[PDB]
Structures are given as C-alpha cells and as structure tokens.
Amino acid sequence: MDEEYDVIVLGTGLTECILSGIMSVNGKKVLHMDRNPYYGGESSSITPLEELYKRFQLLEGPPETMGRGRDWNVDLIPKFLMANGQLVKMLLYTEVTRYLDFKVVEGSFVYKGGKIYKVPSTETEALASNLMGMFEKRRFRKFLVFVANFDENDPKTFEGVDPQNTSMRDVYRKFDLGQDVIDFTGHALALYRTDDYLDQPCLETINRIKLYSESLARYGKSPYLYPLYGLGELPQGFARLSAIYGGTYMLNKPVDDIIMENGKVVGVKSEGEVARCKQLICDPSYVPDRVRKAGQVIRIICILSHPIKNTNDANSCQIIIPQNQVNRKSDIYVCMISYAHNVAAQGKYIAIASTTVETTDPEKEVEPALELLEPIDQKFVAISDLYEPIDDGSESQVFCSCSYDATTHFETTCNDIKDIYKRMAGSAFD
C-alpha cells in the first residue's frame, strides 16, 4: 500500500461499494480492502451451483435435473430497486449504470386472507381487483384519484386536509377504508414495515404512494428493477469504476488493527504495513466493540421447477405478507427470480422467503410463505444476526454500516448510505 489515502473502506458489501464509488467520483483518493477471497461480504453471490450445496454442508452434489451449474448465480441477500427510487439516482451519479443491465420485475403481489393478489395502484386496476368488494373498490378508486391529483403547492387539491397535521388514520377514515385495505396499502404500496405512520402527518405517505405509481413501467408490470446476472454485478462494476479514478481494490487482505489513539481518528495495519487515512468506512464485522445486536433474520432459499401459482406465470415477482394477516409483529417477504434474469438454469426458479425471528422455532415462522411455493425441489436455511453501530463517527471518524434487514427492496439500505454520507461530509447528499 501507499503511505497515505483520503479514505479506507473495509468490506465489499453493497453499502460500502456504493459509498466508495461516490467518494472516488467526488475526487477522493481511496483504498478499498476485504479480508475475504471474494466480493460481497454478507451480501455475496454464489456463482457455481456446486458451491451452494457445499456452503450448506450437503455432500450430495446438485442432481441431474438442476441443469448446468455454471448458469446459476445465487444472491444470498436478494433485493429489488424501485425504478424512480433514490438508490437508482445514486447509481446514476457515479455512472456505474454504464456496466449494468436492468430488467423489470414482472409482478407485485400481496397476501390477504390466505391468498395472494396483485397490488392495484391505478384507478383501472382498483376497479379490477379481487381484493375488495363492489362498494369498497369504488371508495378505493376515489382514494387513488385523490393521491394522483394531490399537489402540495396548490391548497385546492387538498380536500380540506392539512398535509402537515392531519394523520393518515384520518385520511383512511375520510374514505372509509377498512383494516384489510389499510394492511395492503401501508405495507405493499407505501412500503412501511410498521404501522407507526398511522399517527403521523399524511404528506409523507401520500408521496410514497405517488412514487410507486410513477415508477410504473409499461405493460402493467411492476415498479421494480433487478440486474441481469444478479446483485453480484454491483461489486464488479464498482471495482471497474475505481480503476478509472486510480483507486485501489484489494481482496484476501486481512486487517490486523485499526490504528487510532487519543482523538480517535485513524490508520490501518495489514500484514505489517501501515497506511494512513483521514476517514474510515466499514461493516460491523470489523469493529465488534463499536456495535450492538439488533436481532436476527431467517432466510430460506427455495429451488422450484414451476412458477408460483396464482401469479400469471410470472418469471419474477415480489410478494409481501403484512404482519397483521398472520398474527405477527413483523412482515414476511418473498421475492423470486429465475432463468429470465439469468440467475438460474433454463426452467428453474429461485424463491427466497425472509422475516425477523420472533420465536424459538424460526423455521416454523416461515410456513405461511413456504405454503405458497409448496412443491419445493430443495431448501437452504440461513439465520443471520443484525448489528447496528454504537458510534456515529463524529469525533472518531469511523463510519460503520448496519446489517441488511429482512425487506426485499432497497429503502432501508439507501437510508443507511445517506445517513453515513451526512455524518462524513457534514451535509446531505444533494
């Protein structure tokens, strides 16, 4: 290593790679290291099918029926991007989009009463939905038109509501929408994880639903994007971006100690060598004593030889199960991709079910979701601990990221990246 760098990054997970790229684009001299022999950290991709069976201690290799092992690219933590979301804008800023190929996710579904239904975001879809009865549908149709016309710059578009004071609960009441419609609207449209929004000003929720509608994409597909060949393409594209700027990426390089003493600040020692830096970015595994355990998530990867039933034979999809429909305090998510996004062999599908652990039998908690996929060829169970920083980085200049939660989209990951950028640069990412 060189004698000095502006920033040193430890770990090649999604958050770190994105932050690294922004820094290089901003004119910083960066060193990026990882102790592992591969890219991705916790959010890595298993490139050959044989290896996945190995990582899960299954001595019997892949059966004949799974096809060509090289044609599989299994992400361990799959997540979709909202087309007009902020993460995509971060990708545009750096220009890594010059190396990625995005393909739209075919469908978006929600669970209600034991069955899955398409998520309606337009007036036409509302009127066609099997989710609601004749009269409620109509009321739902009014709701969407209200959201579609809302313009915070024109007080006439409000409907006697004060965007900054009227709660969303009052808005649901104004249209007389029942509990079941609220479950799917808050959770599958606005994309909240909890019901805390109910007692907060309505404005935010209005803009969130607007975002879903606007992210549209023709044919009536969905507002989600997923890269061809999977998420593994991101670490690859960024590494290529650093080379343009004269940045340095280094794999299989252990970190012996994070140098820092009095006013904290930093420096890093690897294989005897020491490199100086002004700021440091890292994931939790590099600073066990500056982190606290926030819980656990279960993720079960299922290999299927058939599309999920009750979807119109979708080649990829997002399915959300609100906590309330299954008597839980946390939602269950299921996302599926297949050979259509080039991550599985011809005719094969990959469905990943996830949620936050609440009981002493984590595998039982996911039964609701697994039932939807039933004839399952092979199952791979994985439990992870979640960590969050104790230190914000003010003073110390050590900026640690959070573990990836159970959600199947990038909202919370994007929030973390923005928070860290703010703490680092001392201003908001504009």
Side-chain angles (χ1 to χ4, degrees):
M1 329 181 276
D2 285 22
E3 290 301 297
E4 82 160 5
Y5 295 93
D6 284 313
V7 186
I8 295 180
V9 182
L10 310 181
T12 54
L14 313 173
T15 304
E16 282 81 28
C17 295
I18 295 170
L19 272 167
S20 189
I22 296 172
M23 297 282 72
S24 296
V25 174
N26 274 171
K28 267 57 167 59
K29 162 106 284 186
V30 188
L31 199 219
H32 200 139
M33 309 171 32
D34 193 327
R35 72 188 151 234
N36 296 322
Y38 53 68
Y39 286 116
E42 292 302 312
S43 53
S44 37
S45 179
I46 314 304
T47 320
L49 185 64
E50 281 74 28
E51 278 288 271
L52 188 73
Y53 272 69
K54 280 189 200 304
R55 305 227 183 182
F56 284 89
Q57 309 178 348
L58 218 54
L59 259 34
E60 54 191 309
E64 54 268 24
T65 61
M66 299 278 185
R68 194 158 97 114
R70 260 195 62 79
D71 299 348
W72 294 79
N73 276 82
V74 187
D75 293 332
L76 288 176
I77 294 185
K79 309 212 310 303
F80 295 144
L81 300 64
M82 172 72 57
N84 288 349
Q86 260 186 291
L87 201 128
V88 166
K89 298 171 182 286
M90 280 175 192
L91 274 36
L92 284 172
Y93 180 59
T94 69
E95 293 209 51
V96 283
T97 44
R98 175 66 210 270
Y99 307 116
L100 287 299
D101 284 34
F102 282 112
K103 191 178 186 297
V104 181
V105 179
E106 216 155 66
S108 182
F109 302 81
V110 59
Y111 173 103
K112 199 276 292 185
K115 216 157 294 94
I116 47 168
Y117 302 95
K118 173 183 185 319
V119 178
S121 61
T122 63
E123 290 166 69
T124 312
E125 286 166 5
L127 298 176
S129 175
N130 277 191
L131 266 167
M132 301 164 286
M134 192 190 273
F135 301 109
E136 196 162 37
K137 278 194 191 185
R138 310 290 182 177
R139 303 206 287 288
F140 192 64
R141 195 282 276 147
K142 300 300 166 311
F143 180 72
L144 298 182
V145 207
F146 167 59
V147 173
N149 284 293
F150 184 100
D151 183 328
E152 44 187 273
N153 267 25
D154 182 16
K156 188 171 70 70
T157 57
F158 309 1
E159 294 223 318
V161 297
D162 179 2
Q164 320 188 322
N165 290 256
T166 308
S167 77
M168 193 60 196
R169 191 184 291 261
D170 287 354
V171 176
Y172 280 146
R173 292 201 282 236
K174 177 193 180 85
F175 292 83
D176 205 61
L177 301 169
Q179 186 63 251
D180 294 88
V181 168
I182 292 174
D183 279 355
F184 84 77
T185 298
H187 298 236
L189 278 145
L191 265 9
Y192 288 108
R193 287 114 265 160
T194 66
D195 289 342
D196 288 11
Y197 76 105
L198 239 35
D199 295 342
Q200 288 291 326
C202 72
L203 181 52
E204 190 200 31
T205 313
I206 289 179
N207 293 145
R208 284 175 169 247
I209 298 167
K210 290 261 251 306
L211 181 88
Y212 189 114
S213 306
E214 297 159 69
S215 297
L216 44 86
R218 64 87 61 178
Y219 195 107
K221 286 301 176 56
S222 86
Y224 300 116
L225 290 173
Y226 186 70
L228 236 43
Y229 306 117
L231 283 174
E233 299 288 305
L234 266 66
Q236 287 180 235
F238 275 117
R240 236 147 293 232
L241 209 236
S242 35
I244 308 288
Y245 291 96
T248 67
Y249 265 60
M250 296 181 184
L251 292 187
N252 216 320
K253 287 218 55 183
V255 180
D256 309 313
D257 188 42
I258 297 177
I259 310 310
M260 59 194 281
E261 207 45 43
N262 305 340
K264 297 282 194 182
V265 206
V266 262
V268 155
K269 178 152 58 196
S270 175
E271 293 162 333
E273 289 196 80
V274 162
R276 314 261 101 181
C277 68
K278 295 174 188 176
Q279 294 182 304
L280 176 92
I281 300 172
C282 64
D283 75 60
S285 65
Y286 291 89
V287 283
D289 62 319
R290 298 186 179 273
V291 121
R292 80 180 298 283
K293 183 181 172 177
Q296 289 187 331
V297 308
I298 316 160
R299 195 126 20 172
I300 304 189
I301 296 173
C302 307
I303 289 173
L304 313 170
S305 43
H306 66 70
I308 304 165
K309 66 174 56 177
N310 289 180
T311 58
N312 193 41
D313 288 338
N315 69 223
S316 44
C317 67
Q318 171 68 293
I319 295 173
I320 293 172
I321 308 181
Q323 54 200 85
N324 233 106
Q325 298 292 145
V326 282
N327 308 328
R328 290 179 58 75
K329 301 188 178 70
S330 59
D331 301 354
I332 301 179
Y333 305 81
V334 183
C335 69
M336 179 281 269
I337 51 272
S338 60
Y339 58 89
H341 270 91
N342 292 343
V343 301
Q346 195 58 227
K348 305 295 162 169
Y349 304 82
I350 316 168
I352 309 89
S354 63
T355 191
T356 305
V357 180
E358 302 193 334
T359 77
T360 61
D361 188 339
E363 209 171 331
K364 186 184 198 56
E365 295 180 48
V366 188
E367 277 298 302
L370 299 186
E371 304 219 69
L372 299 180
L373 319 163
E374 250 331 281
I376 303 169
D377 284 345
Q378 181 69 236
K379 250 140 60 169
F380 299 111
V381 184
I383 308 185
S384 309
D385 296 308
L386 305 170
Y387 294 98
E388 37 178 44
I390 271 179
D391 188 343
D392 82 308
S394 71
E395 306 166 311
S396 72
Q397 297 288 294
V398 174
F399 308 100
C400 178
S401 68
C402 291
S403 300
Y404 299 104
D405 63 31
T407 67
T408 40
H409 50 273
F410 277 97
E411 82 300 28
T412 53
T413 294
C414 185
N415 293 329
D416 199 23
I417 295 164
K418 287 180 306 195
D419 188 34
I420 298 165
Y421 183 92
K422 193 206 65 262
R423 301 189 302 192
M424 288 184 72
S427 74
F429 179 56
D430 190 61

